[model samples]
Target: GNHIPERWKDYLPVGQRMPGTRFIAFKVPLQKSFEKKLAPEECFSPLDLFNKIREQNEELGLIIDLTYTQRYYKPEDLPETVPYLKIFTVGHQVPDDETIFKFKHAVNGFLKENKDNDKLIGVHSTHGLNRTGYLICRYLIDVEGVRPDDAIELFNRCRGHCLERQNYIEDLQNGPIRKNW
Candidate 1:
């Protein structure tokens, strides 16, 4: 069985679509195998995840799954119209430049493709705070020229769970961006 992520219950499972961007954040919803181990309210399977997103009047264009394992859910479970990218972002560490570049490349394509509509680009890791926050803010800083302070503030305000990794935060605020190299 796919085990429940640690401290998963400590945070809200999904966050509102951030205003003025095609970004939304959420915890990695599980496959049915984990459902038996979780309470109904706590069991967020793929279907449940999409339904919640759709009911909010949002349409996801692509899901950039950052979880390190495939035990949670298969990419096949995503909606037929939406694309998926599995980046295998290992937990408990800041993501490397290669991972950051892949994320930026993926976002660049989607933004260019969906230039006319408001389709969201959903991102998730295990609990969708640290890796999710770092990459999202990285995009805002590198691609959009948003300041670190503004980007961090926007993500925390929209993501509900403030990013918890001090190293990730320190890097975002004070480290070099992995762009144009």
Candidate 2:
């Protein structure tokens, strides 16, 4: 609820109140689109959008970088200030399932060595419910052991959308997607 200062309260009472808080906004190096293609202004070079997260460190809470649009976000970005990053590359635009499997393996290997869990892992799609969603949802269910219905439910909670097209929802419910799982 917003505080409604009683007239004299705005003028101050017997003593001073606490410090007021302020919020600031900064533009980060994010792709205009999720295709992993970075605009020149968003990056320091062809591959590094490291500038995006650095400038906002003062109020840094979390950074959800939707990666692997067309090119991979370089591995170097993960170890430093970007200790908490979830890089996502979903769709046929990514090399293939094999490459993705390999990439995830590499990331898991790195995290295991570093013992880092402060970083949360998130998957972001260009629009969150297109081809990217189809592939990502399948990968999450089949590879990661995420239950299809539960995964769809949680995604809806966080993103306000889900991967269940009428056909796919029926497929999931009727045990087709489950059989594959």
Candidate 3:
């Protein structure tokens, strides 16, 4: 794995590859106005975060960008040494339920297709507590069959969450079609 830039160079040294990891990230709209052309933090630079992940483990990061305004970061920014980490981004907001379902299905399909010891899912959340958050949570837990408690623990460990409810968690608990034994 390659080393991340100086912003968080002090972070833990790059560790051994964790198996079955996928880094899910979303394009976060800046709290500040982009019209002013603000600094990096003003609008998150996915490239910067990607560099950070590059330092640690290369699980072929997966990103979901629902915001139509912000363009997804280009993959060319990463160093040649790192393997091609799979990054997926949305060009538009998927407000429609069917579209969201399709996106989730594609992701879940990808996860199902790639199940090697070297493959790990790294879920990166800049502000993944609402719309994008719900979708990802549903996809991982419901579609992919990641256990609720275990999935929450994994997400919490991977990404520090600050989620506030839009609805009951129980309502979002089960899958669209529960698989029976």
Candidate 4:
């Protein structure tokens, strides 16, 4: 049942951190076994991800993985310096409150612990668009007071791929805030 993600190539591989936030987004880095499924020109592995981050002159403090499966890559595959946390959210539906808190807490905890560093909290969920955008926008909306529309626009613009799911869009725009104010 494993396969390359649909339309994974339609978007940029990684995005520069959104201005004013220590956040960046990118598609999941495939392990070598998974990379075999991609053309050499299209293959993106964990080291490729790290190299790109270096090209941006940015540092990654943590990686928040949202992909539903672990077969893609292992945390040890990334640099020993970077921490990893996985929070799986099944595709095709908006994530629930617990998932939202996990995202928020992971981010908040990282920011708290690394108050002096400019390190980014890198996030990925499969193609790194919908669930990635939703949780990121959710954090901005609920905690940062970034208005829903602005948050959505920021994610879409930075990622070079607008959020695609109507369910996710509507929930971010009109659904209840996952975090209590």
lDDT of each: 0.86, 0.36, 0.42, 0.88
lDDT of 3 by residue, 1-181 (tens): 2222222222221222322335443334222233245444344454444555556655443444443323333435433233333223333332345645655655666566765534443333224433444555556666567765555445444444423343524434542533333
Return the TM-score for candidate 3, rounded to 2 decimals.
Answer: 0.54
**In terms of TM-score, which candidate is stronger, 3 or 4?**
4
Candidate 1 residue pairs in clash (backbone atoms < 3 Å) = none
The true-versus-predicted C-alpha distance at residue 64 of model 1, in Å, is: 0.4
lDDT of 4: 0.88
Model 2, 11-123: lDDT tens digits are 11111110121111111222224333433432322123233323323322233334443432333544345344444544334224554454355444544654533333223
Model 4 clashing residue pairs (backbone): none
**Cα lDDT for residue 179, candidate 2:** 30
Error of 1 at 124 (Å): 0.4
* Cα misplacement distance, residue 49 of candidate 4 (Å): 0.6
Residue 106, model 1, lDDT: 98
List the lowest-lDDT window of 10 residues for candidate 1: 72-81
User: How many residue pairs clash in model 1?
Assistant: 0
lDDT of 2: 0.36
- Residue runs of model 2 more than 4 Å from their true location after superposition: 1-80, 83-96, 99-103, 110-116, 131-136, 164-181
